[PDB]
Amino acid sequence: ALVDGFLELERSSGKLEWSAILQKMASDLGFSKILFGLLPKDSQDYENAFIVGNYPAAWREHYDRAGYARVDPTVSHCTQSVLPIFWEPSIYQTRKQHEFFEEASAAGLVYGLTMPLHGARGELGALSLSVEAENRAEANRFMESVLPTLWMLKDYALQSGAGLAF
Amino acid sequence: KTHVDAIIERYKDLMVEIPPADRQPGLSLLWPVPAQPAIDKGVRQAENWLADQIEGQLWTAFAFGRDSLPTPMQKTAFEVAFLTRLQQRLVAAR
Amino acid sequence: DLMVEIPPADRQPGLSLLWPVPAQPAIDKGVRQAENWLADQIEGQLWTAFAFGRDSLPTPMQKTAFEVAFLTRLQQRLVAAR
Numbered sequence: 001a002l003v004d005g006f007l008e009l010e011r012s013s014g015k016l017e018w019s020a021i022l023q024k025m026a027s028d029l030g031f032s033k034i035l036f037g038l039l040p041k042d043s044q045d046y047e048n049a050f051i052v053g054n055y056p057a058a059w060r061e062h063y064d065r066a067g068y069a070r071v072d073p074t075v076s077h078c079t080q081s082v083l084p085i086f087w088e089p090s091i092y093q094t095r096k097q098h099e100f101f102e103e104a105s106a107a108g109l110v111y112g113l114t115m116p117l118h119g120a121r122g123e124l125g126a127l128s129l130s131v132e133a134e135n136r137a138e139a140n141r142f143m144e145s146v147l148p149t150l151w152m153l154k155d156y157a158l159q160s161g162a163g164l165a166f
Numbered sequence: 167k168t169h170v171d172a173i174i175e176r177y178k179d180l181m182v183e184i185p186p187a188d189r190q191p192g193l194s195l196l197w198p199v200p201a202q203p204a205i206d207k208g209v210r211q212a213e214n215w216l217a218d219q220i221e222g223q224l225w226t227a228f229a230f231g232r233d234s235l236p237t238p239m240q241k242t243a244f245e246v247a248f249l250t251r252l253q254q255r256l257v258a259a260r
Numbered sequence: 261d262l263m264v265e266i267p268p269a270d271r272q273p274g275l276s277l278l279w280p281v282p283a284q285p286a287i288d289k290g291v292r293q294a295e296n297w298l299a300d301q302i303e304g305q306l307w308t309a310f311a312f313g314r315d316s317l318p319t320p321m322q323k324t325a326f327e328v329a330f331l332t333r334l335q336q337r338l339v340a341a342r
């Protein structure tokens with residue numbers, strides 16, 4: 001089921017089927033929203049990266065124009081770390097972040113995580129999934145159990161997604 | 167039936183357990199394939215090295231243990247288990 | 261020459277590896293990753309720091325160098341329960 005989705009991921013012909021498979025796999029893993037973003041080596045043109053997924057349309061439009069890529073705690077984490085980042089209220093410290101958080105929360109992006117991507121050819125990116133859980137405890141427990149399967153998703157996605165974005 | 171619990175319920179079979187050690191242990195982990203034996207090989211492998219005296223050859227136990235598993239998917243189940251076991255006893259030690 | 265070095269830590273401390281290809285940067289990457297986990301007390305899984313850390317190395321030879329340094333570093337403090 002998940003193993004089959006991995007294979008379909010690698011078999012994907014174009015951005016459309018691949019991004020479709022990526023969403024279908026997030027939804028099966030109990031995550032209603034997923035975003036994958038990937039820049040070439042040594043680029044910071046966030047708004048013009050390869051970006052796919054099913055994030056809420058209203059929010060994606062806002063995110064690009066407002067340049068939230070430079071605000072988002074997960075984005076600067078990805079460029080400085082390998083470890084995944086859970087969306088704890090604490091990752092949002094500064095004013096523009098306490099404010100990025102309010103709105104992201106209104107868009108449904110409350111609970112979830114971001115996995116940084118560091119490709120073999122030095123590519124940089126982010127794989128985020130959001131889950132609708134009763135509260136933060138349930139969400140963080142849930143995400144710790146499925147984290148191994150997600151890290152393999154991250155791996156099949158980075159590998160197959162680089163030779164389609166680029 | 168919560169949402170997060172309902173995802174656990176399907177995937178019943180693909181779930182695997184790293185039993186409790188000393189620190190707050192019992193990790194319950196979803197794996198893409200059934201892999202409980204690989205998990206236990208990684209747990210035992212790591213205990214065997216701990217239950218050894220003036221200990222000093224950690225990479226070897228890990229390298230030889232992983233190498234005895236034939237699929238990528240088992241190798242990583244073994245790595246996750248073995249390392250979780252080396253965590254359980256790194257925090258049960260201040 | 262293309263020797264690699266895992267700096268001494270607490271207990272059983274050191275190494276003299278002739279690595280097949282140059283890999284000191286990868287060794288350091290592995291040491292730092294492990295001590296960054298030992299230091300910052302459990303906020304994420306140790307398995308996570310190992311797996312996501314290894315991913316960031318490009319080559320099988322580098323990845324393996326990362327792993328050796330990571331597990332050695334753990335060994336050092338693990339032994340330190342004298």
Ligand SMILES: CCCCCCCCCC(=O)CC(=O)N[C@H]1CCOC1=O
Nearest residue numbers: 037038046049074078104109125126128
């Ligand atoms: C390293 C980033 C390069 C590619 C640019 C990606 C831009 C989009 C990143 C993003 O959407 C991450 C994300 O999921 N942010 C969450 C955090 C809270 O809600 C958000 O939208």
